[PDB]
Design a protein around this ligand. Structure first.
Ligand SMILES: [Cl-]
Length: 129
């Protein structure tokens, strides 16, 4: 499965976070994708956005939709999975189905220091405009 290079992926995601999948929510029959409630640990990018655009449950829980999206290589998860999520707030035309949800934009990444480092680096590199 061909996946875009880290640089482009970081460009196309206004929010990058880390967290553990607590539970699988309902399904989206129109796009054949699903949602899960995620307990965030820390944001590697876009925190300010989530703060102003997403209503948080439990102070540290969000809901990401878009899982199982064919156009993404690593798009599956299970209860307890830990990942680095490249997301974006759901557009309004995806409402009210995906209202107040962050939408998976690209392949999920495993929580390893190498990844955390590389992502942070690419995030900081681009933050140099
Ligand atoms: Cl991808």
């Amino acid at each position: 499965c061909p996946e875009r290079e880290l640089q482009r992926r970081e460009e196309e995601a206004n929010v990058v976070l880390t967290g553990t999948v607590e539970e699988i929510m309902n399904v989206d029959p129109v796009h054949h994708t699903y949602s899960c409630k995620v307990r965030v640990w820390r944001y590697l990018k876009g925190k300010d956005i989530v703060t102003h655009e997403i209503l948080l449950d439990g102070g540290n829980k969000v809901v990401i939709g878009g899982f199982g999206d064919p156009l993404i290589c690593d798009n599956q998860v299970s209860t307890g999975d830990t990942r680095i999520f490249f997301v974006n707030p759901a557009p309004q035309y995806m409402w009210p189905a995906h209202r107040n949800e962050l939408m998976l934009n690209s392949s999920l990444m495993r929580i390893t220091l190498r990844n955390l480092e590389e992502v942070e680096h690419c995030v900081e590199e681009h933050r140099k405009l």
